[PDB]
Amino acid sequence: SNAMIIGAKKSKSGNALLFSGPQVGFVAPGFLYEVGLHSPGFDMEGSGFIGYPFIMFGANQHLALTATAGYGNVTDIFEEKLNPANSTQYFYKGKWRNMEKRTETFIVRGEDGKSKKIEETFFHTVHGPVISLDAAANVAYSKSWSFRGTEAKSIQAYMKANWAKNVKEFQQAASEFTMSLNWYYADKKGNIAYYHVGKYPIRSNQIDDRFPTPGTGEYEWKGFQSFAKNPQAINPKKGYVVNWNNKPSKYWRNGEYSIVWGKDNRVQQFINGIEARGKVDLKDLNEINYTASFAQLRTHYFKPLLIKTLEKYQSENKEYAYLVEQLRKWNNLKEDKNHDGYYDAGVAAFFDEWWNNTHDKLFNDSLGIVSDLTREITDHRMGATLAYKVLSGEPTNYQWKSAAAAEVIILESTDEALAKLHKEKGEEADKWRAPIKTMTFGAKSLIAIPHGYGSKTEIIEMNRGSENHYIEMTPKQPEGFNVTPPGQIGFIHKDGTLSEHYEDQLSLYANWKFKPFLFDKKDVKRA
Amino acid sequence: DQKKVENVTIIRDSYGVPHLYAKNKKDLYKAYGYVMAQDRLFQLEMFRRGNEGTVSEIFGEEYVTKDEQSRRDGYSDQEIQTMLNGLDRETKQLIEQFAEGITAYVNEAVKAPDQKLSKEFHDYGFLPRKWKATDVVRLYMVSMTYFMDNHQELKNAEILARLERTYGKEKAVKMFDDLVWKNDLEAPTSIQPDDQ
Ligand SMILES: [Ca+2]
Ligand SMILES: [Ca+2]
Secondary structure, three states: OEEEEEOOOOEOOOOOEEEEEOOOOOEOOOOEEEEEEEEOOEEEEEEEEOOOOOOOEEEEOOEEEEEEEOOOOOEEEEEEEEEOOEEEEEEEOOEEEEOEEEEEEEEEEOOOOOEEEEEEEEEEOOOOEEEEEEHHHOEEEEEEEOOOOOHHHHHHHHHHHHHOOOHHHHHHHHHHOOOOEEEEEEEOOOOEEEEEEOOOEOOOOOOOOOOOEEOOOOOOOOOEOOHHHOOEEEOOOOOEEEEOOOEOOOOOOOHHHHHHOOOOOOOHHHHHHHHOOOOEOHHHHHHHHHHHHHEOOOHHHHHHHHHHHHHOOOOOOHHHHHHHHHHHHOOOEOOOOOOOOEOOOOHHHHHHHHHHHHHHHHHHHHHHHHHHHHHHHHOEOOEOHHHHHHHOOOOOOOOOOOHHHHHHHHHHHHHHHHHHHHHHOOOOHHHHOOEOOEEEOEOEOOOOOEOOOOOOOEEEOOOOOOOEEEEEEOOOOEEEEEEOOOOOOOOEOOOOOEOOOOOOOHHHHHOOOOEEOOOOHHHHHOO | OEEEEOOEEEEEOOOOOEEEEOOOHHHHHHHHHHHHHHHHHHHHHHHHHHHHOOOHHHHOHHHHHHHHHHHHOOOOHHHHHHHHHOOOHHHHHHHHHHHHHHHHHHHHHHHOHHHHOOHHHHHHOOOOOOOOHHHHHHHHHHHHHHHOOOOHHHHHHHHHHHHHHHHOHHHHHHHHHHHOOOOOOOOOEOOOHHHO
16 A cells, blocks of 8 residues: 655645555455545545445545555464463463363355355464464464454544544544554645554563564563654655555564565655655646556666666677667556557566566575565565665675676576567567556455455556545645545446446546545535 | 435435535434445445354355454454443444444345345345444454454564574574564665654
């Protein structure tokens, strides 16, 4: 998920701006629900996740808000020391403790139509539910959520945010939210504010918080840190805040999940867009969102590395010369502006294969035996920090490859990628243009169960929020535009007829058009 | 359009988005649940089933292990009621109204199922059940917990253990620090330390 808030000084009109882009996948019915709420002293338009009694992306009369996944450290796994003579007992504070037992029944619809009945036993310790067993080592793994039992207090906190009228009330609501999210704030007075919300535990400083914590009782949480210690800022001096699930602040850690917060981070797409402009408007935010959605994210750090290597040898290798010309003219996007079904920049097909070849050569001979666990780290969708440090010759703890060995890899990957394109397409980069990846608003969301029948319509894959709001807090009222695909109404008639509002926003989404943000009842009636 | 479900006016714009106009929050949040049910009743039903670990009753064995995971890590109704009882009385009451709103459309749709129950209900041969405030909290947990929950600590332990047994502890420790760092000081940040 990505977000941007622009303070008054960074905005052309002098009004604070807000941009939302929650990434919760693409399903039909959609993962978001858009609504307008209006009661005495409470007027708010926007969308929230399906089922939530509050808006998460939009604005009330006073403030605009959005959120992104925080990726903070709110989940710890505890390594329970089991009794060798009783697997349902673990050692805690000097004495054996009995696990809590619970038998659950599951009814399963058989393909034949009838239903079967399955029984399972789940176990609990003082730290939480047992998620895994290492019986061979007399170990059980339990899971502690910092937000255990406080999910309803988080709902209440989000509802108080809806009702809030100023930074003070919004921050109070932020301070009560117990789960790990980034909150973004913009108001009609020109203020913007950012909060890494959640209840983050005070951990033992005698453990490595990238690994499970021994459950014997000496390394227990000692409460939660004060909200003042949560990353946050009101009116940061840079004049704005951008985020794509990246690190909140230089020294804020998230233990086991650091892999999302490296030098190579996809937020660079939003940093580049904002830093390449002076004062900005909603039009600008939209062009930066377009860039992020279609960018080949490895290009930021790895296309310069590639070019630097090839330029050393392009005098004698005409193919390297042609590649460097094509790479340099490429705008780093995998886009389909003419809607011919093929990405416009043919050299993007080469870069894709070059990267894949390069990642394989960097780590296969060392991590291949563990690539079932590490490939998702070293080829992460948010960035390839370790790969970049190796190829760029920057310091690493283990000497993976020298800068000279790295260059040899970059070259070998180029030769192999180019040789495959010559054999299958030809020598002109125009012929390398790859067919666009498409997707559909399907039936199954991140909760991993079916909630409908989905949608047929194929649109180009976009690394983009599942909705977008562009809001400008003008002195009069919030203003702007948004899109909430596939459509408002997920109703299918018994006879198969889709509601007229089942997917009437998919064309807007795929063609980078939007509908007006409505706040004034006068405008709502004529919409 | 501009309907009037109870003392709340509902204006649906050209995209079908409902705009609710109420005289107090109690009415507003009931209408909130009602319009969401009008538009997404089957989706609400299945999302609630996701949290309760009862999807297998509808879509079969393919979702048994997901149901088991949901119940393993989930809460009982009484546990969720205890959470609601810890909220401000107004907040609890509005969540109840939200559920009463959903229940209002449930009751309305079972009385005219051929026109108000979506096709999935007819094809899979079951009916939606009424709603309680606890179920509303369930709709929040099923989706929001996903973004907080992970077992990367266990993956990390397995990574270091398999590196250690092949390469030795000294080398594995260095490899793992490059894989899962303690703090990459050059990672882009949303705010600077001076902004705290
Ligand atoms: Ca942790
Ligand atoms: Ca094209």
